[PDB]
Design an enzyme around this catalytic site. Structure first.
Site, PDB file in Angstrom:
ATOM      1  N   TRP D  21       1.115  -2.495   4.216  1.00 45.36           N
ATOM      2  CA  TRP D  21       2.443  -1.784   4.543  1.00 45.36           C
ATOM      3  C   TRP D  21       2.232  -0.819   5.542  1.00 45.36           C
ATOM      4  O   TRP D  21       1.510   0.203   5.273  1.00 45.36           O
ATOM      5  CB  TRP D  21       3.066  -1.242   3.448  1.00 45.36           C
ATOM      6  CG  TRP D  21       4.320  -1.446   3.253  1.00 45.36           C
ATOM      7  CD1 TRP D  21       5.035  -2.589   2.481  1.00 45.36           C
ATOM      8  CD2 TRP D  21       5.464  -0.542   3.529  1.00 45.36           C
ATOM      9  NE1 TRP D  21       6.548  -2.419   2.824  1.00 45.36           N
ATOM     10  CE2 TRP D  21       6.730  -1.250   3.298  1.00 45.36           C
ATOM     11  CE3 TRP D  21       5.420   0.746   4.288  1.00 45.36           C
ATOM     12  CZ2 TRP D  21       7.850  -0.540   3.650  1.00 45.36           C
ATOM     13  CZ3 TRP D  21       6.678   1.188   4.526  1.00 45.36           C
ATOM     14  CH2 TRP D  21       7.765   0.641   4.258  1.00 45.36           C
ATOM     15  N   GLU D  58      -1.460  -1.883  -5.333  1.00 40.60           N
ATOM     16  CA  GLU D  58      -2.697  -2.731  -5.797  1.00 40.60           C
ATOM     17  C   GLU D  58      -4.048  -1.956  -5.428  1.00 40.60           C
ATOM     18  O   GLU D  58      -5.147  -2.678  -5.459  1.00 40.60           O
ATOM     19  CB  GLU D  58      -2.387  -4.055  -5.064  1.00 40.60           C
ATOM     20  CG  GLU D  58      -1.273  -4.827  -5.715  1.00 40.60           C
ATOM     21  CD  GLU D  58       0.162  -4.434  -5.354  1.00 40.60           C
ATOM     22  OE1 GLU D  58       0.278  -4.453  -3.920  1.00 40.60           O
ATOM     23  OE2 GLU D  58       0.942  -4.063  -5.931  1.00 40.60           O
ATOM     24  N   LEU D  81       1.932   6.269   2.102  1.00 36.43           N
ATOM     25  CA  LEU D  81       3.269   6.119   1.202  1.00 36.43           C
ATOM     26  C   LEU D  81       4.158   7.329   1.919  1.00 36.43           C
ATOM     27  O   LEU D  81       4.006   8.456   2.106  1.00 36.43           O
ATOM     28  CB  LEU D  81       3.014   6.623  -0.412  1.00 36.43           C
ATOM     29  CG  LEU D  81       2.509   5.513  -0.843  1.00 36.43           C
ATOM     30  CD1 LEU D  81       1.694   5.988  -2.282  1.00 36.43           C
ATOM     31  CD2 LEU D  81       3.472   4.607  -1.350  1.00 36.43           C
ATOM     32  N   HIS D  88      10.983   6.127  -6.225  1.00 36.52           N
ATOM     33  CA  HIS D  88       9.827   5.526  -5.840  1.00 36.52           C
ATOM     34  C   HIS D  88       8.486   6.150  -5.586  1.00 36.52           C
ATOM     35  O   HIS D  88       7.425   6.188  -6.136  1.00 36.52           O
ATOM     36  CB  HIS D  88      10.164   4.244  -5.223  1.00 36.52           C
ATOM     37  CG  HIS D  88       9.110   3.190  -4.952  1.00 36.52           C
ATOM     38  ND1 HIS D  88       8.436   2.267  -5.939  1.00 36.52           N
ATOM     39  CD2 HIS D  88       8.215   2.810  -3.946  1.00 36.52           C
ATOM     40  CE1 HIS D  88       7.546   1.606  -5.422  1.00 36.52           C
ATOM     41  NE2 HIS D  88       7.402   1.821  -4.205  1.00 36.52           N
ATOM     42  N   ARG D 127      -1.495  12.186  11.298  1.00 37.43           N
ATOM     43  CA  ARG D 127      -2.816  12.291  10.601  1.00 37.43           C
ATOM     44  C   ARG D 127      -3.613  11.127  10.874  1.00 37.43           C
ATOM     45  O   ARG D 127      -4.730  10.975  10.065  1.00 37.43           O
ATOM     46  CB  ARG D 127      -2.649  12.616   9.013  1.00 37.43           C
ATOM     47  CG  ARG D 127      -1.616  13.777   8.956  1.00 37.43           C
ATOM     48  CD  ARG D 127      -1.243  13.902   7.394  1.00 37.43           C
ATOM     49  NE  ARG D 127      -0.737  15.451   7.360  1.00 37.43           N
ATOM     50  CZ  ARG D 127       0.123  16.255   8.053  1.00 37.43           C
ATOM     51  NH1 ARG D 127       0.846  15.416   8.932  1.00 37.43           N
ATOM     52  NH2 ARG D 127       0.544  17.255   7.553  1.00 37.43           N
TER      53      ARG D 127
END
Lengths: 149, 147, 147, 152, 147
Positions: D21, D58, D81, D88, D127
């Site tokens: 992702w 995962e 993330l 979420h 980053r």
């Protein structure tokens, strides 16, 4: 839900702090299991502990002595002036969850974590609210059955 | 109304901030002896440097001797950094663990307050109610129910 | 006034932000030697890249050698992301675990501050009190009580 | 300021598990981790295994399964993330960080946290070494090596 | 590109708030069948009262039968109390544990939203994208990699 569980053994462990709300919840749970799911009153063990922090410990101790098909941990936590509420609410919720996965016995969370008395009572079916003890009763039966068959 | 003359209770308390600790430990002990018939010689009182050592100290102790119930007492006060937030959570979860791993009841005598005044009030000073008393009764009850 | 000349202490410190780490490690060591009679030869000092490896490093080391107490030293400063919030919690919970699993005391020498200044102040600079001293003393006590 | 090392680890086997992702950020990080281990620590390209999973949730599960099949000296869990409109972000970030941490302690194998928990895309790229930022994959690579060696 | 005709998938979903659960369960199943060649007869679909039972249900089920991957679907919406905050965390941490303890992949099909609209949107309604689809593909991938 038309699920009947006449051979199920349910355990109910509730704290004694703030009984104005605890009783209606425990009562609702028991009545629903008996009148709607055919559970036998003599197969329902009701025990208590000083407070919500002892809910996991008391449930753990009890399911080690006897055999239950499903457990319901009931208690009420109300936000106070300190950070106490925040920290034990989390600890208890994570705790019950653990006892359930460790033992393999279903543990229904009958823990209300509210901001004030009124919110707790409303969820106990008072003042036009819906008694959640009823829901926990039905849940206990379903999980109890699905845990066997 | 619950008497437990054959119970062996353990009390582990931090030493940080004793103006509040003492009243709590004292109230706990008094209540157990005066209201639950617990014998003075059956109460062990130990201490650790800080609250973070509460779980570690209690674990070590219940491995050496046999107790029916344990009380973890300590006082945490919000400071200028994020220390309060993180160890409060760690200690509460940690005592809870030792209790479930060992099978020995662990009463939570940890106060997590925003200031010194709230701590003392809950120690029974300034018109407040001494919580150490509640913890004493709780330990007795859990001690008995645990058999 | 606790002396522990036969104690073997382990110190594991992260290397990130040494302006603050050094004072803390130094304060810890000095305090143990000058006030608790711990022998310099008996103090093992190791390091890891950052605070996230603190639990992992400590676990590895106490599996190879035998220590009476351990000190995990590291400094975390709130940044621009949520990184600080999440690993601070993870480390505190993680050191706590290694301590309970191994049975070896683990002193939390972790500062979780909002900025550099707060970190230095707690390292005893700019008029603050060096916390490494408190940790040293804690290590000794827990070490002895663990017997 | 992070202090690195001039440590060589030619016999180390490193595993890299990254989510897929948001690859605009993942690639630079993975690449930085790999190059740094090879060019600065003498790790051998054949000794670096790179695997992927659907997402960060995962990451612990994938790493666990992999270190049960083969033997690695150190692992690096990479993922990104970004705070969204719901809760979420808050909840899985915490779950994953605690999770990797656990896999590391249970198995005894070092697990480097290559997880970025940012508020927006920009913070992630920065980053990842883009737009004048510092590539953190580099730092993770050196970390993996050091932990791998100290683990012996 | 990833076909898994011999895979056995388990779907456990809470029954609370079905306006959103159905679309998600449907999307998951369809995607696994139409895009990954999973066989309808190899997809077991079960349900529990609420999200809190998700970990408990999954644990019981993977103890009776053998699955290659599991998907836990549920919807949690912020309410008036702190309930949402506390069980959201508990369930996310719990599913994660069941996955790591059993060695069976557990896909997180739990939505933790602020309102009904947000849940529906993520169920593919009102112009949103159905996440159930992503969960299905995920399940397949993890199932295969797990071999």
């Amino acid at each position: 839900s038309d699920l009947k569980g006449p051979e199920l053994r349910i355990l109910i462990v509730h704290a004694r702090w703030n009984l104005q709300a605890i009783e209606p919840l425990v009562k609702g749970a028991v009545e629903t299991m008996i009148e709607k799911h055919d559970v036998k009153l003599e197969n329902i063990d009701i025990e208590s502990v000083p407070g919500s922090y002892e809910l996991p410990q008391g449930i753990r101790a009890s399911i080690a002595r006897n055999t239950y098909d499903a457990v319901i941990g009931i208690g009420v936590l109300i936000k106070g002036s300190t950070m106490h509420f925040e920290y034990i609410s989390e600890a208890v919720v994570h705790g019950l969850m653990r006892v359930g996965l460790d033992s393999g016995v279903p543990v229904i969370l009958g823990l209300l974590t509210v901001l004030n008395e009124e919110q707790a009572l409303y969820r106990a079916g008072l003042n036009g609210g819906h008694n959640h003890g009823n829901d926990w009763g039905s849940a206990a039966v379903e999980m109890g059955l699905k845990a066997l068959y």
